[PDB]
Amino acid sequence: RMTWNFHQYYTNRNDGLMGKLVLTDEEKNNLKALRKIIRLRTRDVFEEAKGIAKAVKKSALTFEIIQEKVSTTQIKHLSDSEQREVAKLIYEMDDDARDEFLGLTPRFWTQGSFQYDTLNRPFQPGQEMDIDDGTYMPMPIKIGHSLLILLVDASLKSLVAENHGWKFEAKQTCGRIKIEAEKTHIDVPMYAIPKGSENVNLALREGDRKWINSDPKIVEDWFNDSCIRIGKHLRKVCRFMKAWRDAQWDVGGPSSISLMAATVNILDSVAHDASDLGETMKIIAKHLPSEFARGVESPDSTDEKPLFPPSYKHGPREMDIMSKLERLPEILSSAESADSKSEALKKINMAFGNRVTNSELIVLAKA
Numbered sequence: 276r277m278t279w280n281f282h283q284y285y286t287n288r289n290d291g292l293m294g295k296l297v298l299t300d301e302e303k304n305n306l307k308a309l310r311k312i313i314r315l316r317t318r319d320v321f322e323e324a325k326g327i328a329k330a331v332k333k334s335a336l337t338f339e340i341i342q343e344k345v346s347t348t349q350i351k352h353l354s355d356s357e358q359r360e361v362a363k364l365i366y367e368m369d370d371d372a373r374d375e376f377l378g379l380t381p382r383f384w385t386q387g388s389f390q391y392d393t394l395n396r397p398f399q400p401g402q403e404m405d406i407d408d409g410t411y412m413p414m415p416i417k418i419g420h421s422l423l424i425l426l427v428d429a430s431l432k433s434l435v436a437e438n439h440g441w442k443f444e445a446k447q448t449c450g451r452i453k454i455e456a457e458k459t460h461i462d463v464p465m466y467a468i469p470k471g472s473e474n475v476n477l478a479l480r481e482g483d484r485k486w487i488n489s490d491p492k493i494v495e496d497w498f499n500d501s502c503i504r505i506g507k508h509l510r511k512v513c514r515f516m517k518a519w520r521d522a523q524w525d526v527g528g529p530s531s532i533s534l535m536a537a538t539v540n541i542l543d544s545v546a547h548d549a550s551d552l553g554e555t556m557k558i559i560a561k562h563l564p565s566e567f568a569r570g571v572e573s574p575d576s577t578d579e580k581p582l583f584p585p586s587y588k589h590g591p592r593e594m595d596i597m598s599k600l601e602r603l604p605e606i607l608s609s610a611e612s613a614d615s616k617s618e619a620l621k622k623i624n625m626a627f628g629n630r631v632t633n634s635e636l637i638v639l640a641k642a
């Protein structure tokens with residue numbers, strides 16, 4: 276009969292969960308500003324390296340002179356051996372390769388939650404907002420993997436040198452600048468593309484494969500198609516599931532993309548009503564454990580691994596994730612049946628953290 280309704284608690288843009296999660300325009304503009312700085316520097320580093328290559332096209336300069344030239348650019352912020360390597364790579368280029376490099380101008384495209392608007396304000400101390408800004412290198416389906424990575428690293432490392440409180444982190448799939456004071460990091464995955472999703476190649480930092488075909492547009496188009504198909508509330512509930520994950524784990528938990536994929540599957544196959552996103556979240560929560568136990572398939576069919584493994588592959592971390600997923604619909608049910616508004620709030624905040632504090636967003640209802 277009587278039940279607490281949480282639709283405002285979730286959706287209210289003043290001080291409900293959407294209000295707590297969505298970045299303000301100032302914050303978004305700050306991120307855009309950070310993105311521009313990184314893009315400009317990467318553009319500049321490539322122009323600088325191209326200037327050296329241009330000089331070598333004109334005259335077959337000695338190795339020591341090429342090295343000296345490298346030392347005057349932003350590449351000076353790489354290690355000595357890495358500078359030697361860039362100089363050696365420029366020295367060793369054949370005419371064809373050098374011409375291709377002289378024709379290369381990096382392009383950029385943001386992928387991930389800043390692009391499709393699911394980027395949440397961070398919650399726990401230590402957690403950071405993420406901007407995924409890819410750099411793209413148009414090439415014949417002729418510039419080498421090593422040189423390209425060194426130049427993008429030169430870019431990021433040169434900014435890290437100039438800015439107090441910025442730090443560089445090498446990842447398998449990107450370079451990363453972390454800005455702890457701003458609770459932000461920017462990831463720069465690097466792609467080779469033709470000068471056709473099959474030809475978008477993501478550079479890998481280590482291993483048996485230098486490249487793998489992984490077009491971020493596949494996920495972006497899948498998600499935006501899903502939003503059109505299911506409704507705008509898809510973005511809201513994905514934000515909320517990510518907020519749940521940030522509240523349950525300081526570090527770790529299921530990936531954002533696994534939560535998106537499982538949520539889309541559920542909302543495509545189970546009736547729900549966007550006029551009550553509290554019920555919609557309860558419905559999602561009821562079905563997530565089965566989605567995750569069987570393994571969460573990627574929306575990109577070319578991915579070699581699922582986004583979350585099936586339960587026969589579970590270790591302590593996946594077991595912990597299954598446990599918290601199993602608890603979530605119980606938390607939501609108990610909040611619905613709580614004795615008072617204040618207890619309803621206390622209970623639902625055990626799912627999403629103590630972010631929403633306004634118990635007037637919770638209203639007595641019937642269901």
Ligand SMILES: Nc1nc2c(ncn2[C@@H]2O[C@H](COP(=O)(O)OP(=O)(O)OP(=O)(O)O)C[C@H]2O)c(=O)[nH]1
Nearest residue numbers: 386387388389393394405407491494531532575578
């Ligand atoms: N095909 C594929 N793409 C991935 C995978 N992981 C990340 N990506 C691509 O990178 C994009 C950004 O990934 P994330 O930073 O992990 O997710 P997000 O949507 O930005 O969420 P968050 O706000 O937590 O950063 C999404 C997708 O295009 C994956 O496992 N497979």
Ligand SMILES: [Mg+2]
Nearest residue numbers: 387388405407
């Ligand atoms: Mg991201």
Ligand SMILES: [Mg+2]
Nearest residue numbers: 405406407462
């Ligand atoms: Mg990232």
Ligand code: NA
Nearest residue numbers: 599600602603
């Ligand atoms: Na939980």
